[PDB]
Design a protein around this ligand. Structure first.
Ligand SMILES: Cc1cn([C@H]2C[C@H](O)[C@@H](COP(=O)(O)OP(=O)(O)OP(=O)(O)O)O2)c(=O)[nH]c1=O
Ligand SMILES: Nc1nc2c(ncn2[C@H]2C[C@H](O)[C@@H](COP(=O)(O)OP(=O)(O)O)O2)c(=O)[nH]1
Ligand SMILES: Nc1nc2c(ncn2[C@H]2C[C@H](O)[C@@H](COP(=O)(O)OP(=O)(O)O)O2)c(=O)[nH]1
Ligand SMILES: [Mg+2]
Ligand SMILES: [Mg+2]
Ligand SMILES: [Mn+2]
Ligand SMILES: [Mn+2]
Ligand SMILES: [Mn+2]
Ligand SMILES: [Mn+2]
Lengths: 289, 683, 683, 289
């Protein structure tokens, strides 16, 4: 009921890194404090590292196990955006703002970071556990994928959106907004594929899959809180970032056809400013009564 | 979660193996006591409330000035003397969310149910205090429900039109097409659904003044109308809804149907434009015998005969059209077209099916015109005349465009009060008042036809609710017996009230003298056949109520011959979508879709059992999908024989039903005299 | 392969290192003697030909009846006495494929070039034999070329209008929007291009009778107009072409521009509707200072001040709008808007740019109204007054909708014949006749403004052809000197002819007394500054032709003050697309795009060298993409100072230049007094 | 030395079939004989099948096994083109020219056609035989992919090109030329990756790999001959098409770094005839002259 519509929306959102000139960001970057520059670098590396997993494994593995030519095509398009567009865009932002040695060090740090690794490996673990012709394991991976697309990225997106809403780092903020807009539709689409599997299950199996999804969400959420304090306490933003995480967790759940888990909260206004039954012929005697 | 929402949700919690139906009374009581009484603006006296409402641009001072304040106070006393209680939470919720007057910021509530009913009655009476009290008694007893436009807007300063169904004829010219687009946008701006007859428009690939193959056909006009309705979206409140009708013998019929396919191209597909197909008996005869049929280019027929193809009788003119070399046509398979219609209705519920000869064989105003198309809800079937909109400097030739005023009798409340005659006559008076007070300044043909025809639509609702609460199955022969008797009585008293109004005003509708009412041909089946109930159980339902006999019908025929008839059209059974909840009634004469209605409002889900549903009558509330559509056709044809206009007839289909089954239902409806088919709803 | 296109393809075969340009003479000779003379219907005498054409609905009897057949014979002899020969295959091919009359089945050829010219001349003269002979001499010498509508339809029975550019003002009402859609379809049906001003329409999120956020903005009207133009496409041979104009200070400006983005959704993007942006000097000043600009909600301004925003001076009311709390405004970055304009022009060529204060600081009829928008070709710049189309029962207040008749002088042939004065006066007479014989009976404001303003557009072409064939570079100061002198002389003689027509007919254009012609302020730079050529090379080009001095301009100013002017507007330089081939001329006053133009017609490929192209002037025919756009802006601004209306100014951009270069060109054009910028063509 | 330039070329060649309006072919299609229309439909259906498998399976699986984020980005982009652009374009053509029943019939015909099933079996079998960290199985699949890109498509491409060259079906032909332009660069790129693996081998191993490549080519060739006769005999063109496929077989071998295998022949000259702006911010000095 939905793949051709998503095909259309995906292809009409096509864009390339070269379209946004990045150099003019240096005119606001130079005015940020060390903590602001540090947080931005770390957040950016976090997003980059997670998005690479999605391009190399997450999207291609789901495309492999999903049946249907049109679904495979949409999924291929999404994988292309991760690898050919998003990855180049993140690299471009980095190369503009930091010298080569600084980029290498930030990636070394974020690569060793406990909270980034915990979530990255949790997601990758579920992708690696998909078994051929087992729709339960596929569903679990789709849940992981939706959580990445619609939830885990947002502790990171917060900061570029926060600057973007203030008139700072506008070129890279525009790029991030385009990336985020792609991840939103990716999350919704994979969510619909997960609901299709979920709806084929018994009531007991459904309850079991719901428990899986909520348990996974809880593990990721508790790690996000720690990740958030680790990055944002030094710039005084953690309280507001936490509200943004919960709001996006609720969107991820709704993508999977589940009820919101967290109470409704208002979001930081600066970040908001940034954001066929069966054909049968008539065989006569049907005109006579 | 609100307390009333929790209480309403306890209906599904099964206690002792039964639904807790009594929780809805607790739900509505909690809803009122906790939200409505808190959010209802209260005034020290009725005078202060009325002054606040008129001075703050909520009411109209014109209709309220017709009464002394003592009379208005007594009318409000009559409304509150009944101590009306909403039986279910959904009734009160629907009223106070859709029809109750709210502040300009939509924060508080100015009007209760009694206040709204009093204002509507005072507007109906137009200066008569006793008449206003009679209307108050009729509506607070919930015997008669004015349509959503009338009920919502009557007596309001910032109101839309009291009419929401309009039927426009479109002539084969760019001037007329542009005028049709303009009038459609103007009427959609007022909040009314607009139906357009596209049969006169010449097909695709026709000549425009010696330039052959230049016309885009009816689909270009369809795109224009779809964008016009999308633009005129009722100030961004409710999506603009319009309908397009095409004769099945029109050349563009296949292109017309292809606009509703799921695979339709974006340059062909129309989104906000419903489609209805008009089918003469000739098409059904051709499909029955499997003879290959012909669709005709309308402009060739107009050039050859000087008359539009849809202005002529296809039964006599089809052979002449086919044998005429100067009339252009292409071969079609009528059975394949029928199968395509059934497939489209299965996929999307479209098109509406209007059986042209079923409508016109009992049409009382064929002298004025034949009925060529229906409205957006497929129940308005009236004569129309196309307008000739000329150039800007020239004078236009204004025709007749259909627009009738809707009202619904509550069959359960009318039957329990034994007041068929009084309710029918008062509803006729109110509909007549709404017709007279309606003046539309941008649809000249609609205004002219409203002034001339004076047509009204008096519908009925709660048929299935009344039958199930009386232990009668909807498909049972006793149900059809009750429908026969009840709607014969409704027709009798509507004709009597129309003739009484004609006698009082000394005027009939325009071109009444040529109607079957004037010649007495209308009353033949009524002066020849007795329509009293044939079952003792049904005859007991009408106890204490005089059922008109053959002699009564002869007296009515003599009265109509002597004094004339004020309304060209009186009765049409509209779907009655949202007013059914307020009246605690089943929608229209259709059977119920679900026994308990599960709906989500905001973030909270609500449950609405059908009115009167309980353990004793649970299986008399048979769902429409579980029913035999042949028996539903039989019921609607029993009702249709007493309704001068059509009935909104929705087909309720199972997922297992094939295209052949839908075609069989359509052909049996055609065989049984069904005039229109509204929707194909699949479970 | 046809012999003539085989010969025409031998131009590119380089013999001895040079293009074989003489093959095109052989190509056209073969084209004639192998296709045209064979497919030409030949009659025994001209009388039989004219009788055949009149009887079979090819010509109009009324205009041919004003001459005795001896006079028509004399006119046809005058046409054929010249023995005109097309110099290139493309000229004859374009004429006999687009403008030559053909039989009803498009099989044979009825009109030669001389026949068409004689018919157009007899149509222009309106009974005068000597005037008809003068027109024949003017057109057969190819000194003046009537526009494609006039040249194609003059004297034909089944014809469109002789005017194809129309400008409509849309008022902020649904009645006016419906009338705009109707008039747009009526004028597109006639074959004309329609431009609409959408600035008076209130923005998205404005109230419609005290319900807020109800208006869909100008984009909904844009979609309506786009579908109206798609519907009225005249068989689709030339699909309906429309233009929409919005002031840059309209709140919907960003959504107006987003309709042309490649990534636009199907519910927003318009395809058949060109877009133009009107930029007051205030916006350029705000962007220059990098200040924060504000776009405004037009309905708030109209409610607060009683006037539309585009009817007010933004350079004097912008601060008042910003300081007014009751005016609703949205903050924008003017430099970001300029960059978006440049990017949109790079990616699509849209929007058209109108520098409103450049138009209105020299506008002669600001008393009637200021110029608020241009046409579809972005060169018609006339005062307009919006109409007030009311309800059906009410009378409409008809305003002034712009339309002018187009006609081009051939600069090369006019300069060769030393006949600037005679050509300008005869072309003015012909355009006046076309204006007088035009009667649009479905566009009331177009008709009223045609009767009142009597505006004509007399353009020129072959400027680059004349300069390149005279050894003058387009960017050279000598070229601008020639353009200055030539167009000053054209303005002088057009004003003289307008004053003489006013004296003869005893009437001026409506509200002439308030114009700058009546006050004499128009002639200030002409009575103060001498426009004689400053270069001896250019001065010899005008040898044998009198150049009006300051004394001559003073005498003309006195003559105009004592007799008035018949035309409110006289000169506008249109693109002159397809008639440039027939006249063997470069298109308009713009530089050439390709030295040898390669085209594919059907399955045949043919090449068109620029008129007069050879090896001795190969490098004087510099392509428009290889030259500095600043010097082209200088040339157009030199010409623009003698043109009362605008010039269709296409920007020819290389792929290497960024959006900053396009913005710099736009800002230099605004600085140099350029009124409009037509297209951003990229190679 | 080459991936970056292929990346840039691939992304700059990006297109969608909707960019080309197809209603212009309606008349030249109507005018073809029933035999010609039948061959044309079947030819494009055979192409659709090949692109379906190249997009669903071939390109994603090669992407999985090739090392390097940039190489993977190119291969992912090529995969997207196969199924999201190329395979879909054929349906755009079908939906314009043919009624639904003829479309349904031709897709049923691909399922039961023995030559089309054999070629799919052979190519997809090799894709699915790739073993992780086994460069030889990867080489074999890359040879198969080059043979699909640069040889197998051409029995299909012949006919749209043959019409385009006569000025017939030129809108459909424009789509096909865009597809062909893509496949040419896809075949070169995959060819270069195959050569990388081949060049790592001993002389003895190389000799075996050439045997594999030539044996596979001959087996595919013999099947393609029968397929060609089956499709083209009814339009009288089988011998001409055979010359064309031999020509392209040599190009496939060359893409693999091997010598041409078939002798040169004269190809139908008809078929031979069948073959944003940068954003820069405004300066203050730009407003003064
Ligand atoms: C009726 C209607 C109007 N409009 C817009 C277009 C017009 O420019 C604008 C004016 O509509 P009007 O036709 O002038 O509506 P009105 O006169 O009742 O409202 P007002 O008193 O404010 O004048 O509203 C819509 O966008 N959608 C609609 O459906
Ligand atoms: N007081 C009051 N009465 C209202 C209001 N809305 C409707 N009514 C009805 C209730 C009564 O039937 C009628 C008269 O009310 P009232 O003015 O208080 O009358 P009275 O009882 O003082 O004579 O008006 C309202 O807001 N206030
Ligand atoms: N005979 C003839 N003359 C034509 C035709 N179309 C245009 N003409 C022009 C040619 C001459 O200039 C003019 C008079 O031609 P004619 O009637 O043959 O006269 P004449 O040659 O006897 O003086 O008309 C045409 O079809 N036939
Ligand atoms: Mg007509
Ligand atoms: Mg208004
Ligand atoms: Mn990504
Ligand atoms: Mn993603
Ligand atoms: Mn491909
Ligand atoms: Mn490929």
């Amino acid at each position: 009921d939905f793949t051709q519509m998503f095909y259309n929306q995906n292809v009409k959102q096509f864009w390339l890194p070269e379209e946004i000139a990045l150099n003019g960001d240096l005119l606001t970057w130079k005015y940020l404090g060390k903590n602001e520059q540090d947080t931005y670098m770390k957040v950016l590396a976090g997003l980059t590292l997670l998005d690479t997993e999605q391009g190399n494994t997450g999207m291609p593995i789901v495309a492999e196990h999903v049946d249907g030519h049109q679904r495979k095509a949409v999924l291929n398009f999404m994988a292309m955006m991760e690898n050919a567009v998003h990855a180049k865009s993140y690299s471009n932002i980095f190369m503009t703002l930091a010298p080569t040695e600084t980029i290498n060090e930030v990636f070394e740090w974020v690569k060793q970071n406990k909270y980034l690794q915990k979530k990255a490996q949790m997601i990758v673990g579920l992708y690696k556990a998909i078994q051929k012709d087992d729709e339960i394991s596929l569903f679990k991976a789709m849940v992981a994928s939706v959580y990445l697309e619609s939830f885990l990225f947002y502790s990171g997106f917060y900061y570029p959106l926060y600057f973007y809403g203030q008139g700072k780092l506008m070129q890279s903020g525009e790029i991030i907004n385009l990336i985020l807009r792609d991840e939103a539709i990716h999350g919704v689409y994979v969510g619909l594929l997960a609901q299709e599997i979920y709806n084929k299950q018994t009531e007991e199996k459904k309850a079991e899959l719901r428990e899986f999804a909520i348990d996974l969400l809880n593990q990721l959420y508790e790690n996000e809180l720690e990740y958030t304090e680790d990055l944002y306490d030094q710039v005084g933003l953690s309280h507001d970032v936490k509200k943004f995480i919960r709001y996006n967790a609720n969107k991820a759940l709704m993508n999977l056809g589940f009820d919101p888990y967290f109470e409704e909260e208002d979001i930081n206004p600066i970040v908001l400013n940034g954001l066929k039954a069966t054909v049968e012929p008539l065989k006569d005697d049907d005109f006579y009564f | 979660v609100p307390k009333w929402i929790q209480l309403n949700n306890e209906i599904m919690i099964q206690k002792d193996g039964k639904f807790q139906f009594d929780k809805d009374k607790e739900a509505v009581h909690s809803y009122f006591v906790d939200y409505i009484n808190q959010n209802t603006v209260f005034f020290h006296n009725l005078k202060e409330k009325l002054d606040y409402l008129v001075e703050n641009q909520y009411y109209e001072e014109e209709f309220l000035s017709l009464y002394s304040f003592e009379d208005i106070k007594e009318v409000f006393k009559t409304a509150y003397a009944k101590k009306f209680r909403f039986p279910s939470f959904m009734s009160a919720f629907k009223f106070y969310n859709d029809y109750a007057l709210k502040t300009n910021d939509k924060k508080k509530i100015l009007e209760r149910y009694e206040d709204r009913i009093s204002i509507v009655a005072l507007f109906f009476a137009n200066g008569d205090t006793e008449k206003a009290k009679e209307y108050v008694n009729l509506m607070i007893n919930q015997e008669y429900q004015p349509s959503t436009p009338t009920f919502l807007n009557a007596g309001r300063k910032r109101r839309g039109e009291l009419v929401s169904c309009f039927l426009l004829e479109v002539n084969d010219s760019l001037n007329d097409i542009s005028r049709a687009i303009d009038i459609s946008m103007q009427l959609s701006k007022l909040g009314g659904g607009v139906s357009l007859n596209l049969s006169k428009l010449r097909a695709k690939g026709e000549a425009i003044k010696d330039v052959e193959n230049a016309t885009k056909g009816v689909v270009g006009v369809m795109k224009l109308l779809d964008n016009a309705f999308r633009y005129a979206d009722q100030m961004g409140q409710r999506q603009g809804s319009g309908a397009a009708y095409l004769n099945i013998f029109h050349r563009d019929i296949n292109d017309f149907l292809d606009t509703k396919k799921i695979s339709a191209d974006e340059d062909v597909r129309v989104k906000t434009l419903s489609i209805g197909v008009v089918i003469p008996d000739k098409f059904v005869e051709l499909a029955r015998e499997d003879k290959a049929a012909y669709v005709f280019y309308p402009h060739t027929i107009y050039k050859e005969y000087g008359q539009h193809m849809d202005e002529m009788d296809m039964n006599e003119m089809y052979d002449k059209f086919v044998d005429n070399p100067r009339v252009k046509k292409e071969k079609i398979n009528p059975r394949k077209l029928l199968e395509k219609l059934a497939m489209l209705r299965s996929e999307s519920g479209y098109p509406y099916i209007m059986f042209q000869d079923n409508v016109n064989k009992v049409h009382a105003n064929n002298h004025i015109s034949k009925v060529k198309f229906s409205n957006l809800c497929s129940e308005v079937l009236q004569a129309s005349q196309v307008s000739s909109y000329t150039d800007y400097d020239e004078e236009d030739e204004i025709g007749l465009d259909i627009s009738c005023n809707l009202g619904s009798l509550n069959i359960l409340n009318v039957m329990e009060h034994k007041s068929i005659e009084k309710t029918v006559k008062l509803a006729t008076d109110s509909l007549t008042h709404v017709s007279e007070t309606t003046d539309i300044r941008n649809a000249p043909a609609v205004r002219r036809a409203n002034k001339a025809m004076k047509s009204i639509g008096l519908g009925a609702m709660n048929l299935h609710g009344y039958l199930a609460q009386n232990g009668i199955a909807y498909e049972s022969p006793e149900a059809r017996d009750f429908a026969n008797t009840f709607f014969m009585m409704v027709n009798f008293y509507s004709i009597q009230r129309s003739a009484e109004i004609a006698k009082e005003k000394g005027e009939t509708f325009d071109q009444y003298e040529g109607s079957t009412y004037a010649t007495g041909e209308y009353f033949d089946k009524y002066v020849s056949t007795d329509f009293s109930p044939k079952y003792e159980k049904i005859a007991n339902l009408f106890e204490g109520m005089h059922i008109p006999t053959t002699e009564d019908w002869k007296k009515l025929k003599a009265f109509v011959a002597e004094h004339g008839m004020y309304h060209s059209y009186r009765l049409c059974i509209a779907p009655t979508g949202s007013i059914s909840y307020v009246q605690s009634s089943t929608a229209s004469v259709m059977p119920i879709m679900e026994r308990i209605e599960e709906r989500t409002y905001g973030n909270s889900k609500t449950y609405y059992p059908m009115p009167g549903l309980a353990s004793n009558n649970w299986f008399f509330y048979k769902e429409a999908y579980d029913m035999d559509m042949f028996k539903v056709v039989d019921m609607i044809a029993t009702i249709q024989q007493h309704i001068d206009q059509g009935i909104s007839f929705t087909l309720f289909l199972k997922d297992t039903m094939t295209t052949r089954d839908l075609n069989r239902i359509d052909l049996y409806a055609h065989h049984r005299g069904i005039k229109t088919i509204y929707y194909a709803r699949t479970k």
